[PDB]
């Protein structure tokens, strides 16, 4: 039969432009927002509304049609929905670049530790290739330890030039487990966790120069979007829940992490809305950051992996993106 | 959640220190701001929604409950010309009981502005003098012991 | 209806149609709920 | 490439027309040239003045009721089918045109080029029928604080001076 | 148009490679097969790829092939003018 | 009381209601039995999923965290500390610690399975109401087996 | 009502961009805000308690004098002089005509501030306004 | 408003039409799915001026269609609807909801929200029609309509408008 | 570059440098399902209306 006519002009992908999504994108984009962390109404007979299997999301059944679009399962692609996180979490996939990114700039005011003013850093920036310069720019930064408020001129090291700075030392970031965690040297050293707010807080301090510098773009990709704050649903065509004899269902194993997700971010919610002392936020805050981190990667070294029932570790999307029998 | 509550909204301040105790007060530059944005955005919202309600009402479906405004129920009315029909119910469309609550919304700002006049009046002299911003130290210099023998050391 | 809109755009007359394997679109789900916006475009930017 | 996605409301008000419906258009040659507005009347002419074109391209290769019936007769014969739509353009213009003769726009578009209004407010001068200058700056909103009222109450005068039959 | 040379300075090769037939030879063909009209007489024949052969062979296909440079440039060659030596 | 969202196949051309419809499970088509006019084409049969039943557990999707190829100790003891310090699944851990009892109990006496299922299903229907609180667990698990 | 707006007290303090406008039909102070929503889509009533004089947007403009009584007289002033127009030189340098014609003017301008004889008085200025 | 605007249509012939003829086929297509069509982008196409110097770029194969595809630019006359304008009509219909004014090749719905409170609806006169002291509103009436609001999409356009300011309505 | 090896890896890093991508060669087009501009598509097939209208 093949799909229906459409309006539409019939065109040919000509780029493909990569970026990230920013929290506002992602909230416009959705079209429901997932409350309930179940899948079946009390009866068992249709999907609950705001649950993971929501009606809104599209339809993988052959007898129905999409809340959306009114459309079947041969013509609907599938509508994104989005959950609202409790704290924002760390991206498993760019923890590393968040690192790098942290000690390139000053965790106090958000400029660069090291300006034009230094004839090294001239050259760097002066770099055509974002990836070398960015590499370039982290060597020279990550030995500074001091803000710099001021710097000599460069006419002369004579008299000292005042630069927008603070003054504030800079600590020695590590990442131990999911956390980040910065040591200060007095004038042994003092440590705590950087919490992921105050990162986020930071990255949204930095110029629109600032970070272009770092190889970021100011409308595809910033730093700020790098901390995942509203966390995108994919609709059930991607996590499709098959059945064995069709009178018994199983559902995907992203479903499976997705409730987990739903529950460790109510818990949370409930947790700090009355009491929760903070020691148990932070608990709380891991489990939730573990749980998002594996639902991307569920290969992550040094950490768990988050199991099923039957014991077969969860598959998650870097998994299905990767091998021979992956996706590409 | 009495303390939970409070430390959201900015109005109390917690500060922790090594002596890991938990200590409490009041920031008073803070709490300023909190009370002088939130009343703001309150009667914000208040007069935000009564010029949304003084538009046109809408439409909705009895049966899916979709929300239909003025627009998207004149592109689909049958070819008869004589009723709404809901797209993915192909029913008639009942209208919306939003006409009334036009005079109830401004009954309630009128009465809020009345109630909040006090916090008004003084934020119109805390703008006028001099705010000094509190800290834990400061704070002490106003300390009053709150138990003979108190297990916490009131000490910087 | 022949009704096409893009929520968040908020635009109705700006819409393409285009035929990519499945698989593809199945990629580009999977990248858009891991924070990654695989963007298709019709028109070039940059000459070769 | 920049997905902005920032676009001002259309409004006849602010004489925002769009982006597609900007003052300077530019042309199939490639030459920046000036938006034109068309009023009831001026379409009613350019319109028909094509229709009668393309009748004799294909032969080569009065009150309102005669000529209603006319243009009905010739826009069946000169026009393919699916014409449903031009149908009621040309019954609609044809009932409430201003102008008749080609003589009568041309002195009209004459007299309201001298103002220096913007296309859309010319056309929008031409097309509505105004008694006095309180009508056009109520039912016209952007003609306020464009133009005294001296000035438009003797163009609306002299626009219904020349008012036809 | 500053992408398209102009016939008198065209610096690409005048034989019709492998690949420009064997679409030219397919394009044509699903054409005819389309009840496209043919402009070759034909003496008995109904296989539109031999059709199209035919039509090749005596130079009654108006198409004409746009070849593209690696900048962006093409050119633009009749299927008449191009000659048929492989 | 909600939208239909429903889908049923019916021939335009033979316009008969109800249809013969046969599904061509190895050619992928369903058909119109009467014309022969394919009706929908590219249909799916009825690992990466998991099949649970929900009769005894209802809906309830959780998953463990145990070690894999490369784990800390630390991670392990304190993620699981953070499950276990969950206020939802505790009313529902009551009920899954009954059968996982009622379970060992069926085991230790050498019954089939359907048993326990039969009477993991039966302390799950007579759970949660008013009459079955002042009477001893023993005494539940036991009436259920 | 020192900086709040009647109807919506939308406070100065608060709402500093706040701008005041009065209409010549009842010279009701009104905050912009209030305007546009009332009045957008249509003529309606004044909002005020006892008012039931209806107004136009298009009519609004910005308070000149801080007393809304001297308002009121200046702006019947500049419609009385827009057709009671005359100079010395009208009457031939005759100052007791003038000054007499002056003297007249003056006393329908204070009619019609106070309303002495409206219907009168109102029919006389459209009488003359044609000649 | 009535507007003269340089479009761009991508005309697509079937193999059928590659005769010595095609041409003229295009130009045929063109009159057969241009004028009359709706576009939310440039509103009502009505007519094409110059119907003899319409400019055909050279046609593109497509892969596996087999069709040719055509740039067409070309010069037309199109009616594009917008918020605030005020426009005369004629009444077609009349319902309780609101009577639908005919302006050219739109219809513009007045809702009763956006009609003067004097204005009522009798269904008892045959046909129904707004009765009011000043004025009576029916089918073939000539009515005097401000666009209030418009939504355009991308083969369809409707637009709603209102008759409470003043010197609108009944003529 | 993701088709080969690291294919998560290198997706991660092109979405933090906004990366672009021209689909000029025959991975993006296999990928995109389109005819890939090698061989037989390294040229477009166009009609002739000059040669056309002499033909007939
Ligand atoms: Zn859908
Ligand atoms: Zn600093
Ligand atoms: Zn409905
Ligand atoms: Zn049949
Ligand atoms: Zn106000
Ligand atoms: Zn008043």
């Not at chain 1, 065109?11 to 927002?33: C, D, M, Y």
């Not at chain 1, 929501?54 to 399962?73: A, F, V, W, Y």
């Not at chain 6, 939208?3 to 051309?13: A, G, K, S």
């Not at chain 8, 010595?20 to 004028?35: G, S």
Request: aromatic share 6%.
């Amino acid at each position: 039969v093949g799909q229906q006519y459409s309006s539409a002009p019939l065109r040919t992908v000509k780029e493909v432009q990569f970026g990230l999504f920013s929290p506002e994108e992602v909230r416009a984009i959705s079209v429901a927002k997932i409350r309930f962390p179940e899948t079946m109404d009390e009866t068992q007979t249709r999907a609950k509304i705001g649950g993971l299997n929501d009606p809104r999301l599209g339809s993988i059944d052959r007898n129905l049609k999409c809340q959306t679009c009114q459309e079947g399962m041969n013509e609907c692609p599938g509508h994104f929905g989005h959950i609202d996180l409790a704290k924002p979490v760390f991206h498993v996939g760019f923890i590393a670049k968040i690192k790098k990114v942290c000690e390139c700039v000053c965790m106090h005011c958000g400029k660069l530790l090291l300006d034009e003013h230094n004839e090294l850093m001239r050259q760097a920036l002066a770099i055509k290739d974002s990836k070398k310069r960015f590499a370039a720019i982290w060597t020279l930064c990550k030995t500074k330890m001091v803000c710099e408020t001021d710097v000599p001129s460069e006419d002369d090291p004579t008299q000292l030039v005042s630069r927008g700075g603070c003054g504030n030392t800079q600590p020695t970031i590590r990442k131990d487990g999911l956390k980040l965690v910065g040591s200060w040297k007095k004038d042994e050293p003092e440590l705590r966790v950087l919490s992921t707010e105050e990162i986020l807080n930071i990255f949204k301090h930095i110029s629109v120069k600032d970070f272009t510098s770092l190889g970021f773009n100011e409308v595809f990709s910033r730093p700020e979007w790098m901390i995942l704050t509203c966390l995108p649903v994919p609709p059930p065509p991607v996590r499709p829940s098959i059945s064995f004899n069709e009178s018994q269902r199983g559902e995907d194993d992203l479903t499976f992490k997705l409730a987990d997700i739903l529950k460790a971010n109510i818990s949370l919610e409930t947790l700090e809305h009355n009491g929760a002392p903070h020691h148990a936020i932070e608990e709380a805050e891991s489990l939730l950051q573990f749980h998002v981190a594996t639902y991307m990667d569920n290969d992550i070294a040094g950490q768990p992996q988050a199991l099923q029932k039957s014991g077969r570790p969860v598959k998650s999307i870097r998994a299905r993106l990767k091998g021979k029998e992956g996706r590409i | 959640p009495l303390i939970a509550r409070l430390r959201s909204d900015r109005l109390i301040s917690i500060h922790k220190q090594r002596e890991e105790r938990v200590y409490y007060y009041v920031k008073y530059p803070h709490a300023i701001d909190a009370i002088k944005w939130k009343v703001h955005q309150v009667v914000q919202r208040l007069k935000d929604d009564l010029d949304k309600n003084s538009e046109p009402n809408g439409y909705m479906c009895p049966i899916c409950l979709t929300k239909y405004t003025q627009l998207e129920a004149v592109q689909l009315l049958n070819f008869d010309r004589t009723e709404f029909l809901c797209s993915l119910c192909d029913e008639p469309l009942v209208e919306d009981d939003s006409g009334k609550k036009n005079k109830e919304k401004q009954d309630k700002l009128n009465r809020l502005m009345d109630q909040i006049q006090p916090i008004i009046d003084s934020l119109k002299k805390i703008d006028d003098s001099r705010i000094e911003e509190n800290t834990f130290e400061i704070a002490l210099a106003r300390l009053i012991p709150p138990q003979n023998q108190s297990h916490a050391a009131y000490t910087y | 209806h022949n009704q096409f809109e893009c929520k968040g755009c908020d635009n109705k007359i700006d819409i393409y149609q285009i035929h990519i394997p499945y698989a593809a679109k199945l990629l580009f789900q999977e990248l858009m709920a891991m924070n990654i916006t695989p963007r298709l475009y019709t028109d070039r930017s940059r000459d070769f | 490439r920049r997905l902005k996605k920032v676009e001002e409301e259309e409004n006849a008000a602010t004489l925002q027309l769009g982006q597609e419906f900007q003052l300077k258009q530019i042309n199939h040659q490639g030459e920046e040239e000036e938006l034109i507005a068309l009023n009831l009347s001026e379409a009613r002419l350019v319109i028909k003045e094509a229709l009668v074109e393309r009748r004799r391209a294909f032969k080569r290769s009065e009150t309102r009721e005669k000529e209603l019936e006319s243009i009905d007769v010739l826009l069946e014969q000169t026009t393919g089918g699916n014409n449903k739509d031009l149908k009621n353009t040309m019954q609609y213009l044809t009932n409430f045109s201003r102008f008749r003769d080609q003589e009568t726009v041309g002195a009209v578009i004459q007299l309201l080029k001298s103002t220096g209004l913007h296309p859309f407010e010319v056309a929008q001068l031409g097309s509505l029928a105004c008694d006095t200058a309180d009508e056009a700056k109520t039912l016209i909103p952007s003609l306020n604080n464009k133009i005294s009222d001296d000035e438009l109450e003797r163009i609306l005068k002299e626009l219904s001076n020349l008012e036809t039959l | 148009k500053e992408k398209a040379i102009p016939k008198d300075q065209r610096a690409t090769t005048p034989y019709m490679t492998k690949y420009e037939r064997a679409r030219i030879l397919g394009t044509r063909a699903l054409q005819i097969s389309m009840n496209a009209p043919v402009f070759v007489d034909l003496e008995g024949e109904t296989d539109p790829l031999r059709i199209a052969m035919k039509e090749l062979a005596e130079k009654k296909i108006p198409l004409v092939i746009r070849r593209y440079l690696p900048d962006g440039s093409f050119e633009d060659w009749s299927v008449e003018e191009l000659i048929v030596d492989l | 009381r909600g939208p239909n969202l429903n889908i049923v196949l019916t021939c335009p051309e033979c316009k008969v209601y109800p249809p013969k419809i046969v599904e061509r499970f190895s050619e992928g088509d369903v058909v119109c039995a009467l014309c022969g006019l394919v009706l929908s084409d590219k249909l799916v049969d009825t690992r990466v999923g998991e099949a649970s039943n929900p009769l005894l557990d209802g809906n309830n999707l959780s998953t463990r965290i145990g070690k894999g190829e490369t784990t800390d100790m630390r991670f392990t003891k304190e993620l699981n500390k953070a499950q276990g310090k969950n206020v939802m699944d505790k009313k529902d851990n009551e009920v899954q610690a009954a059968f996982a009892k009622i379970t060992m109990l069926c085991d230790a006496a050498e019954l089939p399975k359907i048993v326990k299922d039969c009477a993991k299903e039966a302390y799950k229907l007579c759970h949660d109401e008013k009459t079955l609180k002042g009477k001893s667990m023993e005494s539940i698990m036991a009436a259920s087996i | 009502n020192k900086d709040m707006c009647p109807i919506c007290k939308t406070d100065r303090y608060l709402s500093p961009d706040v701008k005041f406008l009065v209409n010549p039909e009842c010279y009701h102070r009104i905050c912009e805000s209030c305007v546009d929503r009332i009045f957008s889509l249509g003529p309606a009533q004044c909002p005020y308690k006892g008012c039931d004089k209806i107004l136009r947007k298009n009519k609004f403009k910005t308070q000149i004098f801080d007393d809304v009584e001297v308002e009121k007289e200046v702006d019947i002033r500049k419609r009385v002089f827009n057709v009671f127009n005359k100079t010395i030189d009208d009457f031939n340098g005759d100052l007791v005509e003038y000054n007499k014609y002056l003297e007249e003017v003056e006393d329908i301008i204070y009619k019609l501030d106070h309303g002495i004889d409206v219907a009168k008085t109102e029919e006389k200025l459209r009488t003359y306004e044609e000649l | 408003m009535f507007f003269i605007k340089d479009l761009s249509l991508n005309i697509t012939l079937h193999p059928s039409f590659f005769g010595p003829r095609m041409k003229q086929y295009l130009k045929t297509k063109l009159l057969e799915e241009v004028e009359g069509s709706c576009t939310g982008k440039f509103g009502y196409i009505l007519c094409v001026l110059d119907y003899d110097n319409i400019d055909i770029q050279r046609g593109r194969i497509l892969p596996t269609d087999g069709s040719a595809e055509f740039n067409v630019k070309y010069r037309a006359v199109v009616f594009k609807p917008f918020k605030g304008e005020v426009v005369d009509g004629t009444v077609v219909s009349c319902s309780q909801h609101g009577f639908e004014v005919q302006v050219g090749p739109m219809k513009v719905f007045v809702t009763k929200h956006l009609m003067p409170q004097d204005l009522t609806f009798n269904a008892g006169s045959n046909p129904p029609s707004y009765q009011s002291s000043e004025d009576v509103i029916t089918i073939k009436s000539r009515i005097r309509v401000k666009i209030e609001g418009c939504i355009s999409q991308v083969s369809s356009i409707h637009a709603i408008g209102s008759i409470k300011e003043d010197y609108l309505g009944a003529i | 570059r993701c088709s080969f090896e690291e294919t998560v890896e290198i997706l991660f890093e092109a979405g933090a440098s906004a990366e672009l991508d021209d689909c000029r060669g025959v991975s993006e087009n296999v990928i995109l399902g389109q005819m890939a501009p090698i061989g037989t598509g390294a040229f477009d097939v166009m009609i002739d209306e000059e040669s056309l209208v002499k033909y007939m």
